Amino acid sequence: RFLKVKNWETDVVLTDTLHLKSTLETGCTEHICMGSIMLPVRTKDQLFPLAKEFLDQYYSSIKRFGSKAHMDRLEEVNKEIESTSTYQLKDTELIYGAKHAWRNASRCVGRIQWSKLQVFDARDCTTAHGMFNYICNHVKYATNKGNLRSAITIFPQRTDGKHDFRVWNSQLIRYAGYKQPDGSTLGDPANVQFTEICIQQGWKAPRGRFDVLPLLLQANGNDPELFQIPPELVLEVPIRHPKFDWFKDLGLKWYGLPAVSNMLLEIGGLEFSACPFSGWYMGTEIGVRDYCDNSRYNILEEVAKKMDLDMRKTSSLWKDQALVEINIAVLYSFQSDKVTIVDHHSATESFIKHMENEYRCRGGCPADWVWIVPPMSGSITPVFHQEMLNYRLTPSFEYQPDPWNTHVW
Amino acid sequence: RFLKVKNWETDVVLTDTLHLKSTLETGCTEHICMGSIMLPVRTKDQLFPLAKEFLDQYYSSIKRFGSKAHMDRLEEVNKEIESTSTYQLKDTELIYGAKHAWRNASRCVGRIQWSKLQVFDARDCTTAHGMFNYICNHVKYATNKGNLRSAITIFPQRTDGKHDFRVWNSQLIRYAGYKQPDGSTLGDPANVQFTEICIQQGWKAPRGRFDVLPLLLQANGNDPELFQIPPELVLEVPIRHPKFDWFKDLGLKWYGLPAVSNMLLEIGGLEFSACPFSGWYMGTEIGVRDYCDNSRYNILEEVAKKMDLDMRKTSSLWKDQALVEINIAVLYSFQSDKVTIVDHHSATESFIKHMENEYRCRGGCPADWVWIVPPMSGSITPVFHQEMLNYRLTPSFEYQPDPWNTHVWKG
Ligand code: HEM
Ligand code: HEM
Ligand SMILES: C[C@@H]1CC(N)=N[C@H](C[C@@H]2CNC[C@@H]2OCCNCC(F)(F)c2ccccc2)C1
Ligand SMILES: C[C@@H]1CC(N)=N[C@H](C[C@@H]2CNC[C@@H]2OCCNCC(F)(F)c2ccccc2)C1
Ligand SMILES: C[C@H](O)[C@H](O)[C@H]1CNc2nc(N)[nH]c(=O)c2N1
Ligand SMILES: C[C@H](O)[C@H](O)[C@H]1CNc2nc(N)[nH]c(=O)c2N1
Ligand SMILES: [Zn+2]
């Protein structure tokens, strides 16, 4: 029942009890571990236990468990579900829920920040044009001229499931990808399908390497509509290197605001299918993954060549040398332009401190080692040596299928 | 039942059926994943099914399933178990067994090599002196003057658990570690406890930074005995860098032969508690872990100092820069001395080819992503982007507790 996690660098052992409150399934069994697999409406009957579980945790959090106000709210919610088949969260409950969804996000190294989250309540939104306005305001608030602030914007909850709010984009800001008659890909190869959907819905594509995609927004189950984020709201950073003058001539840039827009926020059994959220980048996300994944911008070869490395043999570690220089350039460029960024050393150090806090104050911290360990220099970061238990707590952020598969036009 | 794994770089999808032959537990449940946890005498009744399962696998592999020879061997083993409470493996079965334990080792990136393993049968060994001789011979054979050859030496199986053979060393070759009164460590901090045991047992320690430890060998449940591996059998590589001439003056060296000696080999329900095995290094084992872990030789700072890197902020990535140069030096040094080593790019690329082959010919390849992904440059290797399924097949290598915790001292 009570489980130990050990840090093999420091010998510090922590005891996890929080996992006993986990509700959802992992995909693992006693026979098979699926730890490395990326992807392993509610009736009145389903909804009340979920609402109760959540309200209990909420009332406990404000030291009012078993109080009249606790029992009265439980009563009110029960009545509302029985009569309307759903219920509405109080603003206080919504903020608490969103913050805890982040707190519970086992794949997030940045959770030391979880209690400093600005929540924008967009449950009064009714149209796609309304969605666009809310998202611009989120973008400007979160960006804050480069001094980034964590934020989430929460659109109306699912009802019968035929009137879902969805942001079709995977992030609020991403670059277009285009199939060339040449056979190669211009721009971000990850976004080729979404770009085609944008063009088919009417977008006039510039056909460049870093074209910011328009938003495709769906309100109340309606067909999604296209909106362009005001260009002056999209803060970008040209990538240069502190030592290599030639680096700037690769013509690289990235955007300052990482903002996930395709996940589902579950609070007290209620499902918020459009809940874009944003923080700030850890540098490896851009320098290792976006730039160096073979299926992304794939720039290692070009950089290695400009460095005049021996590329004849893998054992020269030319890929590794170039990787580090690309990541140095990313961090330097963001820091020089005064756009918030965190390096993987600093972020993982903070996560260990957060884990210790959470064990001390909460009895555990669900964490997915496969995602928490950075994609370069794993074992020189403290999280590599830290055992982690992965389990699913609610409120939560969940992956959901791309809507173009789901949508009936 | 079919399980699919996807590669997120190539979109290649593979289908696992082999997991249906797993029976032992992972530590995970539908409610918790223990994928990053390092550590998540049989009766007659439990032994015959295990023997039968193994013999069935062995006879299928030689395309003699259900033959008279297969049926006769089942009968013969059944009679041996009922009469002696255990049984002895044929030489052929032992070899098949050891190769398959390697094939099944989900944490091993080197498994493309599994079918090429020299098995030394040391089941006739009776004393620690005898174990010492077998181990010297293994070291010389495996080392092969730098052209490393994979090998395993298998000592007698467990009987009542009161007569175990054990190599107390965690690897056949490792460097001593000495905790100083001021709380600093000389040599390898990983080996301080074991070094203290050796000294207590009578080892005269040179007290330097790279002192090869003596073997501490337990035969037939007796108290262990100390032996020094002949120095001329211990191949070492001084570490230097192809461009940085100051790298040699760090005074680093490492041994060429990585040889795990503390694991338990299970074949057909039998337990081989002493089964040292050796392959060759992947460079990152030395350059990342042994040299750069904070709790090991911990050389990052000194290297970065000598490179004149900006060390005032972690965001200069000075650690990452120094790490790559150290790993270049290890590969360069082994290659220049003609000692077998493989880089992490080569090794992971070969592993992916091995895994895809196994999926086609065997229906699966259990793999532990947490261990298979190298400890530097993870996402620029193809294994980072490969989904894996981790499950336990037998024959297998298992961790066992250090013998000093459990040993009954006779005196
Ligand atoms: C404040 C700075 C933050 C940092 C430095 C940070 C760091 C990260 C990183 C590096 C990842 C892995 C990304 C990937 O590999 O795709 C991640 C994942 C994630 N984070 Fe954060 N995070 C931050 C803020 C937030 C916020 C504000 C939320 C929600 C309110 C959040 C929720 C999540 C979730 C749900 C995932 C998993 C995403 C997925 O499955 O694709 N994070 N975090
Ligand atoms: C031929 C060259 C080989 C290479 C390059 C190789 C590579 C590796 C590496 C890098 C690891 C993880 C090491 C660590 O982090 O401590 C490992 C683990 C392991 N390998 Fe191999 N391997 C090889 C041969 C062998 C052989 C001959 C066997 C047994 C017959 C074997 C069985 C294992 C096992 C059981 C583990 C997990 C060990 C543990 O739990 O501590 N490998 N391999
Ligand atoms: C199939 C996968 C299932 C899943 N849950 N998720 C993925 C998204 C992938 C993961 N890896 C790259 C890409 O994720 C794209 C978004 N990256 C995270 C972020 F950059 F937006 C970010 C950074 C810092 C704070 C907040 C947000 C798809
Ligand atoms: C608590 C742990 C449980 C476990 N299963 N194992 C560990 C040994 C650790 C793993 N990581 C560092 C150290 O293992 C050190 C030995 N590494 C393997 C080897 F170098 F000896 C080797 C490499 C290639 C072929 C043959 C041999 C203790
Ligand atoms: C197959 C494997 O699960 C996959 O490549 C994962 C590994 N770890 C990751 N870690 C993070 N933070 N982000 C990712 O996209 C991935 N990808
Ligand atoms: C806590 C975590 O499981 C532990 O540090 C693991 C991570 N991955 C590893 N991978 C390898 N190959 N060897 C190791 O010792 C470890 N250590
Ligand atoms: Zn698992």
Side-chain angles (χ1 to χ4, degrees):
Chain A
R1 190 157 184 91
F2 291 36
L3 297 167
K4 304 283 181 59
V5 296
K6 176 169 167 168
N7 182 297
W8 287 87
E9 175 187 349
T10 71
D11 281 347
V12 164
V13 177
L14 306 167
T15 302
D16 187 295
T17 55
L18 183 68
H19 72 276
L20 299 156
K21 306 169 198 180
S22 78
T23 183
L24 302 171
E25 287 166 2
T26 56
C28 302
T29 76
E30 313 88 74
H31 297 268
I32 186 142
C33 181
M34 294 201 170
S36 67
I37 307 303
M38 291 202 73
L39 307 163
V41 285
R42 305 203 149 101
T43 341
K44 309 187 188 199
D45 310 54
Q46 285 141 245
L47 191 54
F48 190 70
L50 299 173
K52 180 169 178 300
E53 187 196 25
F54 171 74
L55 293 171
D56 283 352
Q57 77 182 61
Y58 173 78
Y59 275 89
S60 194
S61 75
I62 68 165
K63 295 175 303 149
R64 278 190 142 30
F65 190 90
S67 66
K68 187 154 187 312
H70 185 191
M71 298 303 95
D72 285 349
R73 155 103 285 212
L74 216 50
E75 164 75 344
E76 171 179 60
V77 170
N78 204 44
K79 291 186 148 185
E80 185 171 344
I81 292 161
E82 265 295 337
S83 154
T84 70
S85 80
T86 188
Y87 71 105
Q88 299 295 323
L89 296 165
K90 304 293 178 198
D91 295 353
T92 52
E93 302 167 350
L94 182 79
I95 293 158
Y96 170 93
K99 285 179 182 190
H100 277 70
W102 182 10
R103 201 187 186 167
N104 293 343
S106 77
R107 290 172 162 171
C108 178
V109 71
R111 287 176 278 165
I112 190 161
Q113 289 289 325
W114 72 272
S115 66
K116 294 171 180 196
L117 174 64
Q118 179 56 220
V119 175
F120 291 119
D121 178 2
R123 296 173 290 164
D124 74 5
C125 188
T126 58
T127 66
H129 259 99
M131 291 180 71
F132 177 54
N133 190 49
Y134 268 113
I135 283 160
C136 295
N137 285 349
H138 180 128
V139 168
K140 191 177 170 176
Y141 176 86
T143 301
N144 189 29
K145 306 194 189 314
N147 187 191
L148 312 193
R149 297 179 281 204
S150 298
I152 184 164
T153 297
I154 304 171
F155 291 108
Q157 72 212 33
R158 278 191 129 148
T159 46
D160 59 3
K162 261 198 180 183
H163 298 91
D164 285 6
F165 287 70
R166 288 292 295 277
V167 176
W168 282 35
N169 312 61
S170 61
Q171 293 174 51
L172 300 177
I173 304 173
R174 290 198 80 175
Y175 294 124
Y178 306 97
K179 287 294 154 173
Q180 302 264 254
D182 197 62
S184 59
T185 302
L186 175 67
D188 195 336
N191 297 320
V192 167
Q193 190 177 32
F194 185 77
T195 306
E196 272 173 309
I197 293 173
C198 290
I199 299 165
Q200 134 227 122
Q201 288 302 119
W203 188 50
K204 265 187 80 176
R207 259 195 133 75
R209 181 181 193 203
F210 296 105
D211 302 333
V212 177
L213 285 151
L215 298 160
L216 240 186
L217 310 175
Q218 159 190 331
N220 207 211
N222 292 303
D223 291 343
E225 291 174 47
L226 284 159
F227 301 92
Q228 196 215 298
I229 301 161
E232 69 272 40
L233 295 193
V234 187
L235 175 56
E236 292 176 297
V237 176
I239 314 296
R240 63 280 197 191
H241 193 278
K243 303 255 205 302
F244 300 138
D245 230 10
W246 49 258
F247 202 97
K248 67 176 185 290
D249 300 312
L250 293 159
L252 308 171
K253 59 175 157 169
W254 206 253
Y255 47 88
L257 189 77
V260 169
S261 54
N262 65 172
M263 295 188 87
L264 182 162
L265 167 56
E266 188 191 311
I267 299 160
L270 301 177
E271 299 184 295
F272 299 92
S273 50
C275 60
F277 59 83
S278 62
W280 51 80
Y281 265 119
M282 180 172 73
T284 53
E285 294 182 79
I286 309 162
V288 184
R289 305 303 313 286
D290 299 328
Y291 283 164
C292 296
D293 277 6
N294 263 261
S295 69
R296 300 294 302 293
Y297 279 81
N298 184 213
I299 74 167
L300 270 173
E301 281 207 10
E302 310 144 12
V303 176
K305 280 185 170 61
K306 280 269 192 75
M307 297 176 67
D308 201 54
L309 299 175
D310 193 2
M311 295 171 71
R312 295 176 292 181
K313 26 164 272 150
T314 66
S315 64
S316 79
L317 310 188
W318 65 267
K319 284 192 181 161
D320 312 69
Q321 286 203 306
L323 181 65
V324 180
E325 301 300 344
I326 294 154
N327 281 273
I328 282 162
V330 167
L331 285 168
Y332 174 76
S333 293
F334 271 67
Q335 290 174 168
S336 300
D337 282 355
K338 217 64 50 55
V339 179
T340 305
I341 196 162
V342 64
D343 70 81
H344 53 289
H345 303 284
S346 180
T348 53
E349 179 201 353
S350 297
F351 182 74
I352 290 294
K353 186 199 164 210
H354 174 67
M355 265 187 87
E356 291 168 343
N357 291 332
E358 292 293 78
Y359 274 84
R360 181 177 40 89
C361 302
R362 198 188 188 202
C365 182
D368 181 344
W369 193 101
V370 167
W371 279 60
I372 295 289
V373 175
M376 67 177 294
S377 297
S379 71
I380 63 166
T381 72
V383 290
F384 183 96
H385 304 277
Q386 177 68 60
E387 295 183 342
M388 296 171 196
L389 290 175
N390 193 198
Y391 48 95
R392 317 226 312 164
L393 302 175
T394 53
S396 62
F397 292 110
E398 306 280 9
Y399 189 84
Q400 63 187 326
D402 293 338
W404 51 86
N405 304 324
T406 314
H407 194 58
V408 277
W409 291 83
Chain B
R1 196 195 298 148
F2 307 101
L3 291 169
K4 297 202 302 192
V5 288
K6 173 172 179 178
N7 185 301
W8 286 89
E9 171 190 354
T10 60
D11 282 12
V12 175
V13 184
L14 304 163
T15 297
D16 187 292
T17 48
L18 182 60
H19 70 271
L20 296 172
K21 305 303 176 215
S22 177
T23 33
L24 300 174
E25 288 172 341
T26 53
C28 302
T29 72
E30 311 94 282
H31 294 123
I32 195 151
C33 173
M34 309 244 304
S36 66
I37 305 303
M38 203 101 72
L39 307 160
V41 44
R42 288 194 168 100
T43 68
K44 295 177 155 172
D45 159 72
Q46 56 214 202
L47 185 54
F48 187 82
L50 297 169
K52 179 173 194 298
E53 186 212 334
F54 174 71
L55 290 175
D56 285 353
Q57 288 156 188
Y58 173 73
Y59 279 87
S60 295
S61 82
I62 65 166
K63 309 190 187 72
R64 293 297 184 277
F65 183 92
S67 64
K68 191 178 190 314
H70 180 195
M71 293 304 100
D72 283 351
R73 180 63 178 145
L74 284 182
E75 192 42 72
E76 175 178 63
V77 168
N78 187 224
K79 285 181 75 174
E80 192 167 337
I81 297 174
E82 104 187 50
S83 146
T84 81
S85 289
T86 190
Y87 73 103
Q88 302 295 319
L89 289 170
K90 300 295 200 203
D91 297 355
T92 48
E93 294 163 357
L94 186 76
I95 289 162
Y96 168 89
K99 286 175 180 193
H100 281 72
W102 184 8
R103 200 183 182 174
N104 296 335
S106 70
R107 294 173 158 167
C108 183
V109 74
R111 284 177 286 169
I112 195 168
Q113 285 294 330
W114 71 273
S115 69
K116 189 175 186 199
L117 176 68
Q118 179 63 223
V119 179
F120 294 118
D121 180 1
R123 291 172 297 167
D124 66 0
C125 190
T126 69
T127 62
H129 270 92
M131 294 176 73
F132 178 61
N133 190 54
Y134 266 115
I135 289 168
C136 286
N137 290 342
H138 177 136
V139 173
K140 194 167 172 177
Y141 174 88
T143 299
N144 190 32
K145 296 193 199 156
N147 180 196
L148 272 46
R149 300 184 278 202
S150 296
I152 181 165
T153 296
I154 303 169
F155 288 106
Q157 65 209 46
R158 180 165 292 158
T159 50
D160 55 3
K162 301 184 163 183
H163 290 89
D164 286 359
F165 286 70
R166 292 294 297 272
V167 172
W168 286 37
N169 307 63
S170 58
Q171 299 175 42
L172 298 179
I173 302 172
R174 287 201 88 176
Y175 298 120
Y178 311 94
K179 188 89 141 226
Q180 302 295 79
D182 69 5
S184 65
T185 311
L186 176 56
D188 192 346
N191 298 321
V192 172
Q193 192 187 10
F194 179 83
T195 303
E196 291 174 344
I197 289 173
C198 290
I199 293 162
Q200 183 189 182
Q201 295 313 300
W203 188 53
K204 309 294 165 226
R207 303 189 66 87
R209 191 151 82 128
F210 299 104
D211 299 336
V212 174
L213 288 157
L215 291 166
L216 192 45
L217 308 177
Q218 164 180 329
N220 204 219
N222 293 303
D223 296 346
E225 298 173 25
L226 278 173
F227 305 88
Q228 184 191 152
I229 300 174
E232 64 269 45
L233 265 39
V234 184
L235 185 45
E236 292 176 298
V237 183
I239 310 297
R240 60 275 198 195
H241 189 274
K243 313 192 202 309
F244 305 144
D245 189 54
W246 53 258
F247 201 97
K248 62 170 194 292
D249 300 300
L250 296 163
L252 309 165
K253 64 170 135 169
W254 204 253
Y255 49 90
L257 184 75
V260 168
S261 50
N262 64 352
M263 294 187 80
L264 184 150
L265 168 56
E266 178 182 328
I267 299 165
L270 306 174
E271 299 185 301
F272 296 91
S273 50
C275 61
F277 62 80
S278 64
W280 49 82
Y281 269 114
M282 179 171 80
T284 52
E285 299 178 70
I286 307 171
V288 183
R289 308 299 314 283
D290 300 326
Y291 284 165
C292 295
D293 275 7
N294 292 146
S295 69
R296 301 288 309 286
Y297 283 85
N298 187 207
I299 71 174
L300 276 180
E301 283 218 349
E302 194 184 21
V303 175
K305 276 190 215 280
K306 299 285 210 327
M307 283 166 75
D308 197 43
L309 301 177
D310 183 2
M311 293 175 66
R312 300 166 311 193
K313 42 196 163 43
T314 66
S315 56
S316 71
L317 304 192
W318 64 264
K319 289 187 155 163
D320 315 71
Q321 285 197 300
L323 182 66
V324 178
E325 299 304 339
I326 287 149
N327 276 275
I328 287 171
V330 168
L331 290 162
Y332 178 67
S333 298
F334 273 62
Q335 287 167 179
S336 295
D337 291 353
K338 306 190 156 77
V339 183
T340 312
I341 197 163
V342 63
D343 71 78
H344 53 290
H345 301 286
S346 181
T348 50
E349 181 176 339
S350 290
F351 181 76
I352 287 295
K353 287 185 190 187
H354 168 69
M355 181 181 175
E356 297 175 335
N357 192 47
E358 290 285 79
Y359 265 83
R360 303 187 199 100
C361 83
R362 202 190 190 196
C365 183
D368 180 345
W369 192 100
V370 173
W371 280 56
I372 293 294
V373 176
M376 74 184 279
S377 303
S379 66
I380 60 153
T381 72
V383 287
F384 181 97
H385 307 276
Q386 180 70 57
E387 298 181 341
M388 292 170 197
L389 291 174
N390 195 199
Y391 47 90
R392 289 170 80 205
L393 298 177
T394 51
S396 62
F397 291 109
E398 303 293 332
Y399 186 82
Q400 49 183 345
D402 288 328
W404 51 87
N405 292 316
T406 61
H407 187 67
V408 167
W409 289 91
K410 300 177 170 171

